[PDB]
């Protein structure tokens, strides 16, 4: 159906998903000289103590690393959030080149790729209901910037071979969602939406200022997965990021 190609890419989305033209859409370009500071913001609380990964998985536009959310095993609180969100899964966004690839941009600056940790608000019963409310979601974005190899990441890319085509799934067990976070957790934040169909406007985005490193050699494996399912004509997942959206009204707060 929809995809990051040419005839079904991010542009023709507003066709089947008219909400792609809402007022709180993501990603966006964060204008560092527009970030307004806010004394109501607290440090990001990343309680990934009992985070329990269950299985990596190729879904058709990226690969997700599903986590158990039966209870508050890995939770996100503090920060700009107002509640407790459970980590449900994380996936990546990369581009055909090393010059581009991240969804969000700092002063129109692009990074090699972007990691997204999706969490839903525990006050909405389940992730499904959760993603229907203006606050039911909290997504943590991490910039992957070219440089040195990422021992943490490699333990991921390392298994991609097990999910080359769509639908495929391997048991990715025991994995610190933390191995992936940067060390200094300053952050920007604003009201947005999912950067992919259904594009629901409910994510309360949190992007991390400092990025994590990735070798030019590594992000190279990302674009080895296939969009299509086994049997169908081989289709490479070379690029899968959405362009910066109109910040329209909104405004980007920051923890600094």
């Amino acid at each position, epitope marked *: 159906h929809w995809g990051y190609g040419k005839h079904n890419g991010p542009e023709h989305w507003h066709k089947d998903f008219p909400i792609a033209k809402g007022e709180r859409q993501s990603p966006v370009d964060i204008d560092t000289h527009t970030a307004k500071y806010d004394p109501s913001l607290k440090p990001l609380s990343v309680s990934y*103590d009992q985070a329990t990964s269950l299985r990596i998985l190729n879904n058709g536009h990226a690969f997700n690393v599903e986590f158990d959310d039966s209870q508050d095993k890995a939770v996100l609180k503090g920060g700009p959030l107002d509640g407790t969100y459970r980590l449900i899964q994380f996936h990546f966004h990369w581009g055909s080149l090393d010059g581009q690839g991240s969804e969000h941009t700092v002063d129109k600056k692009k990074y090699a790729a972007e990691l997204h940790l999706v969490h839903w608000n525990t006050k909405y019963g389940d992730f499904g209901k959760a993603v229907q409310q203006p606050d039911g979601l909290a997504v943590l974005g991490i910039f992957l910037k070219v440089g040195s190899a990422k021992p943490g990441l490699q333990k991921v890319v390392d298994v991609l071979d097990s999910i080359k085509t769509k639908g495929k799934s391997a048991d990715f067990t025991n994995f*610190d969602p933390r191995g992936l*976070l940067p060390e200094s*957790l300053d952050y920007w934040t604003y009201p947005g939406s999912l950067t992919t169909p259904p594009l629901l406007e409910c994510v309360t985005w949190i992007v991390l200022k400092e990025p994590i490193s990735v070798s030019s050699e590594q992000v190279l494996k990302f674009r080895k997965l296939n969009f299509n399912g086994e049997g169908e004509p081989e289709e490479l997942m070379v690029d899968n990021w959405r362009p910066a959206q109109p910040l329209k009204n909104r405004q980007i707060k920051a923890s600094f």
Partner: nanobody
Amino acid sequence: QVQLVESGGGSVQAGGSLRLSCAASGYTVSTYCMGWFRQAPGKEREGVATILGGSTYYGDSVKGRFTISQDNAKNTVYLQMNSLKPEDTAIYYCAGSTVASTGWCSRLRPYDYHYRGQGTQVTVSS
């Protein structure tokens, strides 16, 4: 607000040993991952040890003769230093981040942890 007080520093002779302590306020030394790092003069910030409950990690040097622990019953992460070397002479700081992760904690970089203390002078005579 989160106050982080250290104590127990001082001067001791090589081969000696003393125990630094860190008391938290408006913070719970057990929920998140904490640690110590030291700022020796002339040298740059060095990570000593970190802890997140059962998992404790030690800097390649102090490893084996230093020990970190917590007494959450009184919110205090202690740092037991044993058989000190003169090289150890420096200011030791107490840090306490907001990340609950063994992996993130094994990085051993308390000098990047959000909540910091004032440190305590620890001099080792020969």
